[PDB]
Amino acid sequence: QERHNVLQGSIECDNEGVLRFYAGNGISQALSPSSLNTDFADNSNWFDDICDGRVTAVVELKNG
Amino acid sequence: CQYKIYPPLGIARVGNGPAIKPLSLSTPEVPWAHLYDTNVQYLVTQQELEQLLEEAFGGNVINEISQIKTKLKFKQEEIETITGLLGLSHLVPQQQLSRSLDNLEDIVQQIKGALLKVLSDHYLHAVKKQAQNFYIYKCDEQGNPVEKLKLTDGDKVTWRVEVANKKSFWYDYNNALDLSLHTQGSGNLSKNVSKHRLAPAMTAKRRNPNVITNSLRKQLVISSQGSVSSDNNTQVPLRGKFPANLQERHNVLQGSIECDNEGVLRFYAGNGISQALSPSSLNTDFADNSNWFDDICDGRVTAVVELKNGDTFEIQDEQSSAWVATTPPDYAPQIEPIVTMYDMVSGAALKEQDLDNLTTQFSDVFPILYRLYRMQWVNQADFTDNAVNTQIRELNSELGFAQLLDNSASAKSLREGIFNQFRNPLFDQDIDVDDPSNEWVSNSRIIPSKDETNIAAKPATSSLKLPFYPNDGIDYPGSPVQWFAIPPFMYQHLQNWAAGDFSVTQVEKESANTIEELGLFYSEQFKNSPNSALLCARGALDALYGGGFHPGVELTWPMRHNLIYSQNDYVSSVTPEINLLGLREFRLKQDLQGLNSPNMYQDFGHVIAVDNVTASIDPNSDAAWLWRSTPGDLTKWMGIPWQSAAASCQAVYTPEDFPIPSWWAANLPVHVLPLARYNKFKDSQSADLPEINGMTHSIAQGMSEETFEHLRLEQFSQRLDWLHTADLGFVGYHAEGGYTNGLIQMVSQWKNMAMVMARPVENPGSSGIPNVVYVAYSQADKD
Amino acid sequence: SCQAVYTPEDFPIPSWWAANLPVHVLPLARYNKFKDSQSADLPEINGMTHSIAQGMSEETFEHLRLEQFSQRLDWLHTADLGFVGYHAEGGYTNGLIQMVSQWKNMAMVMARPVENPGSSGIPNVVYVAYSQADKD
Amino acid sequence: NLSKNVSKHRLAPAMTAKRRNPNVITNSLRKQLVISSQGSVSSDNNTQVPLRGKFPANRHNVLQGSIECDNEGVLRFYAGNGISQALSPSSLNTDFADNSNWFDDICDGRVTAVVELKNG
Amino acid sequence: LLGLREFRLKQDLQGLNSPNMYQDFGHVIAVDNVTASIDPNSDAAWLWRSTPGDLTKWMGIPWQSAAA
Ligand SMILES: [Mg+2]
Ligand SMILES: [Mg+2]
């Protein structure tokens, strides 16, 4: 099974504690080049780099 | 003349098997050497991979391992050590061997099975590469190759190969331009075709027409080169780029070369990878798809011999150097095309008006009958709808094939009855002349265009002649050139045979009671013929197609003209008494500057037309470069990518169901006998197996012997469309199938198509099944 | 659309409703190449000349009969359903479209006799598909 | 109308062209592909006369036009109704120029007259 | 205002009954046929001597697809 790397996003935090979340590069692809995405919504053999999920954090103060 | 390379035109076929000797094939060096060899393995087998894996072991490997079992899941330099020891990274990427042992936990068997699985995933059932061996022969007899070069201590040979692909740079293939070329006629093409306008040559536009100016169109040409010497057997890749040089670029492996210590060059074609520059560019045309590249190539092979005493011999002139072309796989290597590319070389040297001087032996006519008979394994019409093949079975059944070798009057009607069924390449029979402006219209069965007209067809008044294959003139309904004829010089042999104007030896007669007995006899004549250099020259081309050319399979119509050869001479019969169509010394015309020729990127502007071919005939002309090949010139005409041309090289259905016309079935089969059926007729009723011919032992042995043998022949008779031996777009609920999905899917599925291999039937009993059958292996068709 | 549904595995080929819309049939052209016995006194016997049919061994003659009997043709190929001609597309959808006019030209299966099957293994009653395309 | 440069410098080479409706073979059978009609009208009668052919010729009636003459001798020529059709509904005209199995009611042809004065 | 001209087509005076009503050049037409047509004595000169149907036969069939 050939696998494809999918960049779903990138995250970074500055020194003030602000999280910045970047989406992917807009890369969508099928597992075979001959699989064309001819339907508006439902194309088998395709993936894209859209995603969604859970954002949590832990705050740690100097006093422990 | 000192040394020469053989063959003069070598052939290597693409395949996804590895470029290593144990798992590859070699282009035939002796014609007919293996026609009944039931041990052939044209796909990589489990046993071959297991053997490769065993040899990769120890080496100290086993106790280099054993030392680490004690010392403990592994670490990376931990197994970085125990790869590299194996010597497998030239077969599978080193990455994937790493994580294959990552997933692990007798440890020298957890190791093997994990490695065998990687090798099997990559190579099990893969289409083996057919590599060409090239040899240096020493000369005098003045120009005759006496013996292969034998290197002594201090002697060295260096080989040089320069190849290119110009398919994406060249013109659309619409039809063969030589169909309108004014000629006196050759051994390969009657003057009637051009003289009576039977199949006019069309104009053709450029492929990839949006790339303008010659300078930018150079990017459409893929090229590479390399050298190897008898002083190092490391294999060298021939790797180019497409587009060539923010341009996204693809590496293209055009082939690989290696030379052994004895000075033999072995040339491997590419992996069969074709691709477009954008995934959405589909290859929907049989021949002309813009934005596509493939890894086919062709080019110039030269060498230098350096002897111990300082002497140096350059093998670079066109009389002594060679050419190599790569091609689609041969999916039935033991099934020969009825007219081969070697036959085109032979016919190119003959003038049509001189064919009255041709001398004929029975061994000149036998190949036609034998090859047509063997088409039954790849084409339904030649199994069940070919009256000549059925008459041969009739003769074989009473041990009476030798009557065909009788040149006397009492056998004349027998010979004539067979000859009269063959299409005459004058293309002047079975026609009615409009305007005796005069158009020759066939009154036999035509092949309609897909562009239908709901007007009643004109009823055919003449029987369809043999063979039942389309031809160069397929575009023109009612042209006699819609259908294939054996070329003028081979038809002349058959005509002489029918007339009784042929010779044959008594020794041949004594081995001629069946067609197979005589074929075996003639195979022995090739095998013991002492001219190994010329046999190798012929063997390279006798498995390639010689018609029809639309564009063909491996090569196309420029090969049937003497203008493409710098030398083309008859040398001898295969045997002092037995012609077998003869042995010849031929050489391609070559541009000696190769990739550096100023004509490497020539064309004729917005279109190519037969007028350009007409202008090229004069060797002093501006256009003569067309015949003086630079790398890429032999294959540039062919379909781009080759896979959609292969998917288009199948059946062409007529309104009448039978016979089904087939293009090139000897090399791209059309109807095959699948492994699933072989497994249902190979066994005798007494076989010591719990399952016999797909039945329980008890059921197989309970039925009558007569019914048992009938079931065998029924299974033997089930022929499967070759296009259905892999998923070419017809698999699944409401799958569309159809012609165009075949073209598109063949780019990935070519490597999964059925491969035809001789197999034994140990005890056919009275079933009628021959002792050697030709069976098509694919994953879809295996049960 | 009521025909074969192909799987990745070649065999067996699944068929929807083959008793009423056949999927693989025995054409008239094949019937005419196995219905005769070798003793027939016709100028053509089972599609062979009298000379050839009677010259071959009786075992080979019966083998040829059974080979012909065994040749089954896709029922969708018994009329022009869009696959006929040079570069014809064929395929599923052309079949749907062309059946509107071609349903009346599809092969019709009818019981027919084999008077003397001999040792060939062919039954005395066979079911033969008649169409204009598959008659020859 | 056309510079010699176009041919001289091969700026746009003429292409070969195959026959439309190529499955109809022999000149005699291809005459069926031609639709033709004729008619006459006179100063004596302004009754309109249809120019009506058949396709294939010797099946569909093709009104190629209509002619009238008024009492002053003026000929009025009307064209057809703009009807184009294929011999089978399933034959779609997917090409800009070259669709087999299709006919239309376009035509062109020869216009002649005879003047008959009272003095003979 | 670009002038006024007297012009007339070449005509085959037999019209629908002309022996050249159903002429063609075989399996293809090509510029070679037009080249030969230039010579008024050629067997291709009929190209320029119109019989009914000769002006519109070149155009797209049917005209509606060509218009779209
Ligand atoms: Mg072959
Ligand atoms: Mg029923």
Render B676-740 in DSSP notation, one character per residue.
HHHTTTS--TT--SSEETTEEHHHHHHS-HHHHHHHHHHHHT--EEGGGGS-SS-BSTT---HHH
- Is some CB atom of chain C closer than 8 A to the CB atom of D90? yes
Query: CA–CA separation, B403 vs B138, rounded Å?
Result: 44
Instruction: Spell out the residues 6+ positions from residue B85 whose beta carbon is closer than 8 angstroms to its own.
Output: B59, B60, B61, B64
Listed residue (B510, B512, B634) closest to B565, CA to CA: B634
Q: How many separate helices (H) and strands (E) can be counted in chain A?
A: 0, 4
Query: CA–CA separation, B543 vs B182, rounded Å?
Result: 30
Query: CA–CA separation, B14 vs B252, rounded Å?
Result: 13
Listed residue (D29, C84, D60, D99) closest to B457, CA to CA: D29
Query: CA–CA separation, B424 vs B441, rounded Å?
Result: 15
Give kind and range of the element (H or E) at residue B441.
strand B439-442
Q: Which two tokens stand for residue B229?
A: 């010497």
Query: CA–CA separation, B429 vs B462, rounded Å?
Result: 9
The string of DSSP codes covering E42-60 is STTGGGGSBPTTTTTTTS-
SS3 content of chain D, % helix, strand, coil (to 5): 10, 30, 60
Q: CA-CA-CA-CA torsion for E42, E43, E48, E52, nearest 10 degrees?
A: 160
Q: Do C89 and B717 touch (CB under 8 A)?
A: no
| Helix (H/G/I), strand (E/B), else coil: B127 | strand
- Which of B446, B606, B607 lies at the smallest CB-CB distance from D25? B446
Q: Which two tokens stand for residue C130?
A: 């008649």
Q: Given the structure tokens 């599609």, which residue do they identify?
A: C47
Chain B residues with CB-CB distance to C73 below 8 A? 657
Give kind and range of the element (H or E) at residue B417.
helix B412-419
Q: Long-range contacts made by residues D15-18, C-beta under 8 angstroms, separation at least 24?
A: D15/B202, D15/B203, D15/B205, D15/B607, D16/B200, D16/B201, D16/B202, D16/B203, D16/E28, D16/E29, D16/E30, D17/E28, D17/E29, D17/E30, D18/B202, D18/B475, D18/B476, D18/E27, D18/E28
**Residue pair B9/B322 in contact by the 8 Å Cβ criterion:** yes
| Helix (H/G/I), strand (E/B), else coil: A30 | strand
Query: CA–CA separation, D108 vs D113, rounded Å?
Result: 17
Q: Which two tokens stand for residue B424?
A: 């005459």
Name D65's bridge partners. Answer: D51, D79
Number of residues assigned to chain C: 136
| Helix (H/G/I), strand (E/B), else coil: B770 | coil
- DSSP-H helix ranges across D1-120: 4-8, 27-30
- Is some CB atom of chain E closer than 8 A to the CB atom of B614? no
Query: CA–CA separation, D63 vs B500, rounded Å?
Result: 65
Q: Which two tokens stand for residue B30?
A: 């002796």
Q: Do D23 and B452 touch (CB under 8 A)?
A: yes
Query: CA–CA separation, B757 vs B776, rounded Å?
Result: 6
Give kind and range of the element (H or E) at residue C64.
helix C58-69
**Residue pair B514/B373 in contact by the 8 Å Cβ criterion:** no
In angstroms, what is the span from residue C73 Cα to ligand 2's centroid? Answer: 17
Query: CA–CA separation, B171 vs B182, rounded Å?
Result: 22
Q: Given the structure tokens 């032992």, which residue do they identify?
A: B697
**Neighbors of chain E by Cβ distance (3+ pairs < 8 Å):** B, D
DSSP B560: G
**Residue pair B17/B129 in contact by the 8 Å Cβ criterion:** yes
Q: What is the widest separation between alpha-carbon atoms in chain C?
A: 48
Q: CA nearest A33 in B: which residue?
A: B279
- Which of B450, B706, B725 lies at the smallest CB-CB distance from C86? B450
Q: Given the structure tokens 């197979």, which residue do they identify?
A: B516
One-letter amino acid of D11:
L
In angstroms, what is the span from residue B340 Cα to ligand 1's centroid? Answer: 10
B335 assigned ligand-binding residue: yes
**Residue pair B299/B275 in contact by the 8 Å Cβ criterion:** no
How close is the nearest chain D Cα to the Cα of C122, in Å?
Answer: 40
Query: CA–CA separation, B349 vs B362, rounded Å?
Result: 21
Give the distance, in angstroms, between the CA of residue B90 and the centroid of all CA atoms in the same chain: 27
**Residue pair E60/E30 in contact by the 8 Å Cβ criterion:** no
Instruction: Spell out the residues 6+ positions from residue B157 whose beta carbon is closer than 8 angstroms to its own.
Output: B136, B149, B151, B229, B230, B259, B263, B303, B304, B305, B306
Q: CA nearest A1 in B: which residue?
A: B121
Query: CA–CA separation, A48 vs A24, rounded Å?
Result: 9
**Neighbors of chain B by Cβ distance (3+ pairs < 8 Å):** A, C, D, E
- Is some CB atom of chain B closer than 8 A to the CB atom of E31? no
Query: CA–CA separation, B474 vs B559, rounded Å?
Result: 20
Q: Do D22 and B451 touch (CB under 8 A)?
A: yes
Listed residue (B476, B24, B640, B547) closest to B271, CA to CA: B24
CA atoms within 13 A on the CB side of A42: 0
**Residue pair B512/B518 in contact by the 8 Å Cβ criterion:** yes
Chains E and C touch (3+ CB pairs under 8 A): no
How close is the nearest chain E Cα to the Cα of D47, in Å?
Answer: 24
**Residue pair B432/B444 in contact by the 8 Å Cβ criterion:** no
**Residue pair B321/B302 in contact by the 8 Å Cβ criterion:** yes
Residue C17 φ then ψ, to 5°: -145, 50
Query: CA–CA separation, B41 vs B16, rounded Å?
Result: 15
Q: Given the structure tokens 């016919």, which residue do they identify?
A: B347
The string of DSSP codes covering B325-352 is EEE---S-TTS--SSBHHHHHHHHT-BG
Give kind and range of the element (H or E) at residue B55.
helix B46-55
How close is the nearest chain B Cα to the Cα of C16, in Å?
Answer: 11
CA atoms within 13 A on the CB side of E7: 4
Name A30's bridge partners. Answer: A46
Query: CA–CA separation, B24 vs B148, rounded Å?
Result: 23
**Any idea which ligand is nearest the CA of C17?**
2
Q: For A7-45, b where at least 16 C-beta lie within 10 A, e where not — what string?
A: eeeeeeeeeeeeeeeeeeeeeebbeebbeebeeeeeeee
Q: Which two tokens stand for residue A33?
A: 């080049």
**Residue pair B271/B131 in contact by the 8 Å Cβ criterion:** no
In angstroms, what is the span from residue C114 Cα to ligand 2's centroid? Answer: 21
Q: CA-CA-CA-CA torsion for B25, B28, B33, B37, nearest 10 degrees?
A: 20
Query: CA–CA separation, B165 vs B170, rounded Å?
Result: 10
Give the distance, in angstroms, between the CA of residue B197 and the centroid of all CA atoms in the same chain: 31
Name A12's bridge partners. Answer: A20
Give the distance, in angstroms, between the CA of residue B305 and the centroid of all CA atoms in the same chain: 31
How close is the nearest chain C Cα to the Cα of D97, in Å?
Answer: 20
DSSP B596: G
Instruction: Spell out the residues 6+ positions from residue B49 whose beta carbon is closer than 8 angstroms to its own.
Output: B23, B116, B119, B120, B123, B124
CA–CA distance from B750 to each of B44, B299, B641, B727, D16 (Å)? 15, 24, 12, 10, 34
- From the number of C-beta atoms within 10 Å of its C-beta (0-12, 13-18, 19+), residue E45 rates as middle
Q: Given the structure tokens 């197994």, which residue do they identify?
A: B79
Cis peptide before D56 (omega within 30 of 0): yes
Q: Around Cβ B750, how many Cβ atoms within 10 Å? A: 25
Give the distance, in angstroms, between the CA of residue B20 and the centroid of all CA atoms in the same chain: 20
Listed residue (B260, B363, B271) closest to B581, CA to CA: B363
CA atoms within 13 A on the CB side of B403: 21
| Helix (H/G/I), strand (E/B), else coil: B416 | helix
Q: Around Cβ E47, how many Cβ atoms within 10 Å? A: 17
- From the number of C-beta atoms within 10 Å of its C-beta (0-12, 13-18, 19+), residue B520 rates as middle
CA–CA distance from B199 to each of B204, B431, B654, B663, B676 (Å)? 15, 14, 19, 17, 43
> Which segments within B20-174 are labelled E, that is strand?
25-26, 130-138, 147-148, 156-165
Q: Which two tokens stand for residue B388?
A: 């000549």
Q: Given the structure tokens 């030392």, which residue do they identify?
A: B67
